[PDB]
């Protein structure tokens, strides 16, 4: 991938991870 | 590799140069980077100068000129062939092409 | 020129060089005797004076401060002090 889009994908994944952890 | 010493633009002691829009595609180009052509063309064609002179109500009427400054991004400049790619040694000169007066 | 004589530079380049970059520092300024017309006394004025020098016997200005050198008022005479 383009590095910028890998960065965007990682940011989306990190928001999802934060939401999952906050739910606990 | 660094292709050009000036990085393809005239910005030397500046931080920021305001952008302009390419006359062909309306791309935002830094003003010092864009290719500028100042065209000064007869407002009538050289084929029609005689017809306009004959149809003129005046005798010594000087035909008006048309003064247009055109800005190009390098993409449109290369596609329109105003500029061309050059050899590694030939890139270094800045002398404009001759006007070919004769 | 690999063999320039740094010890003994001629006065031409000694003068063209910057005041600090000379072999020995020498100011480019001097002191001048100034004569105001219609007055008898002589005023000692710095060549690069930053203030308006005035005569005490006449309400007249002798020099006007500029960027580099005090511009003497017209009609005033001046000579150097000991070169």
């Amino acid at each position: 991938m383009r590095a910028k889009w890998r960065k965007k994908r990682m940011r989306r994944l990190k928001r999802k991870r934060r939401k999952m952890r906050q739910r606990s | 590799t660094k292709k050009r010493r000036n990085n393809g633009r005239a910005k030397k002691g500046r931080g920021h140069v305001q952008p302009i829009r390419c006359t062909n595609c309306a791309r935002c180009v830094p003003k010092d980077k864009a290719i500028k052509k100042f065209v000064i063309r007869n407002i009538v064609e050289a084929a029609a100068v005689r017809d306009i002179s004959e149809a003129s109500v005046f005798d010594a009427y000087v035909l008006p000129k048309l003064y247009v400054k055109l800005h190009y991004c390098v993409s449109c400049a290369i596609h329109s062939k105003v500029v061309r790619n050059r050899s590694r040694e030939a890139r270094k000169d800045r002398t404009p092409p001759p006007r070919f007066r004769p | 020129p690999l063999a320039k004589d740094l010890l003994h530079p001629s006065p031409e380049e000694e003068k063209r060089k910057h005041k600090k970059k000379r072999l020995v520092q020498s100011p480019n300024s001097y002191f001048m005797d100034v004569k105001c017309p219609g007055c008898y006394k002589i005023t000692t004025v710095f060549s690069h004076a930053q203030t308006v020098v005035l005569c005490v016997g006449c309400s007249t200005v002798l020099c006007q401060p500029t960027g580099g050198k005090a511009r003497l008022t017209e009609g005033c005479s001046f000579r150097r002090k000991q070169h």
Partner: protein, 129 residues
């Protein structure tokens, strides 16, 4: 700012020697510089040098004889004992047949051979060969 007057002077001499100039001008003078140049002149690596005396720190004009290779400096003036002078000597000198190390000692500024001759250590100043 300039913090090592001797280092600046030695670098200037080295650059002028490399460029092949006949005379070099070193602007900030000092007693340490004069003693270093006197050591070099007594060993013959430089010619006569003349001190232009202004009321500030003077300047020095040195006549270069063209037989100097390097006149570097050791900027942190390390304490040099006679037990490690040999290690300094074979670290800094091109060979054991020539080359000198100038170190400031209690007896004065002088080369390592005289320092060993009169049996004293001191602080490292520089080297030349």
């Amino acid at each position: 700012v300039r913090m090592n007057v001797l280092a600046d002077a030695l670098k200037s001499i080295n650059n002028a020697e490399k460029r092949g100039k006949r005379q070099v001008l070193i602007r900030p003078c000092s007693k340490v510089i004069v003693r270093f140049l006197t050591v070099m002149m007594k060993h013959g690596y430089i010619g006569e040098f003349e001190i232009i005396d202004d009321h500030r720190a003077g300047k020095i004009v040195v006549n270069l004889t063209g037989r100097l290779n390097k006149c570097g400096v050791i900027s942190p003036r390390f304490d040099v004992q006679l037990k490690d002078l040999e290690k300094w000597q074979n670290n800094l000198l091109p060979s054991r047949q020539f080359g000198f190390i100038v170190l400031t000692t209690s007896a004065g500024i002088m080369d390592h051979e005289e320092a060993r001759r009169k049996h004293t250590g001191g602080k490292i100043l520089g080297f030349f060969f």
